[PDB]
Every structure is written in structure tokens, then in C-alpha cells.
Amino acid sequence: RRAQKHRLRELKIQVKEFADKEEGGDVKAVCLTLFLLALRARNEHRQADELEAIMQGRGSGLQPAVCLAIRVNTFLSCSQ
DNA sequence: GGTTTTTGTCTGGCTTCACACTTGATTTGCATCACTGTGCGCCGCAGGCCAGATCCAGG
Numbered sequence: 001r002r003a004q005k006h007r008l009r010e011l012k013i014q015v016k017e018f019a020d021k022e023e024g025g026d027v028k029a030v031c032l033t034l035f036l037l038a039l040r041a042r043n044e045h046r047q048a049d050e051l052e053a054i055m056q057g058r059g060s061g062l063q064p065a066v067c068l069a070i071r072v073n074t075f076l077s078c079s080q
Numbered sequence: 081g082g083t084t085t086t087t088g089t090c091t092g093g094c095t096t097c098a099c100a101c102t103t104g105a106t107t108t109g110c111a112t113c114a115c116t117g118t119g120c121g122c123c124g125c126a127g128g129c130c131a132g133a134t135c136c137a138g139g
Binding site for chain 1: 095097
């Protein structure tokens with residue numbers, strides 16, 4: 001991670017200086033969207049669907065109201 | 081009408097994914113069976129062993 005800062009510590013400046021001009025400065029989703037379109041150019045369409053399902057909390061993860069319904073409706077105590 | 085956005089196009093060509101079928105060969109889903117519990121209370125009990133108070137009939 002520290003060397004992924006050391007190798008991208010100029011392109012990181014490029015993406016934060018383009019983020020404020022193109023949309024306004026939203027640093028997460030612009031590189032997310034570049035990663036989606038990079039999978040499009042790399043031609044994986046199911047993998048990007050798993051990506052957006054994760055980033056909507058669907059393909060795994062289990063949004064915590066559903067886990068609450070599972071912990072409640074099967075008589076599971078909190079320790080179990 | 082401008083201004084930027086929002087979608088459309090191109091054809092040649094690249095990878096990427098679905099399907100044509102079939103016969104087992106699994107794996108996965110769902111009914112089916114005869115039942116459960118929540119429908120009310122209360123306190124010392126049960127089982128057994130033994131020293132000691134009753135007792136009751138024969139000498």
C-alpha cells in the first residue's frame with residue numbers, strides 16, 4: 001500500500017485534479033467508473049455485474065436489516 | 081436561438097459468451113408423516129431404615 005502510493009503518487013494527483021473539474025471532486029466513484037469501463041475494454045461483462053452488485057450490496061455482504069431478520073427469526077441469540 | 085448534455089451512427093474486426101443435443105448422473109427442492117407446546121395451582125416430597133413409643137393378648 002505504501003509503495004502503491006509511491007508508484008502512483010503522481011497519477012493520484014492527476015486523478016484528484018481532474019476530479020474537481022469534471023464532476024466536482026468525488027474521488028471514489030470516478031475511479032470505480034474507470035474500473036468498470038476498463039473491464040469493458042478488457043471485455044468482462046459478468047465481472048462488472050458482480051462489481052456493481054457488490055457496490056450496491058447484493059452479490060454478497062447482506063445489508064444488515066436482512067441479517068437482523070435472520071438473527072431474529074431463527075431464534076438466534078446474539079452470542080450464537 | 082445558444083450551450084452543454086444525451087444519446088445515436090459508422091464497418092472491419094477482435095474477444096466473449098450462449099447453444100445445437102442426449103443420456104445418464106448427479107444435485108436440489110418440496111411434500112409427508114404423526115406429533116410438540118402455550119393454554120391453571122400448591123408444597124416439600126419419595127424410598128427406605130431404625131430407635132422408640134403403643135399395644136394387646138397370654139402367662
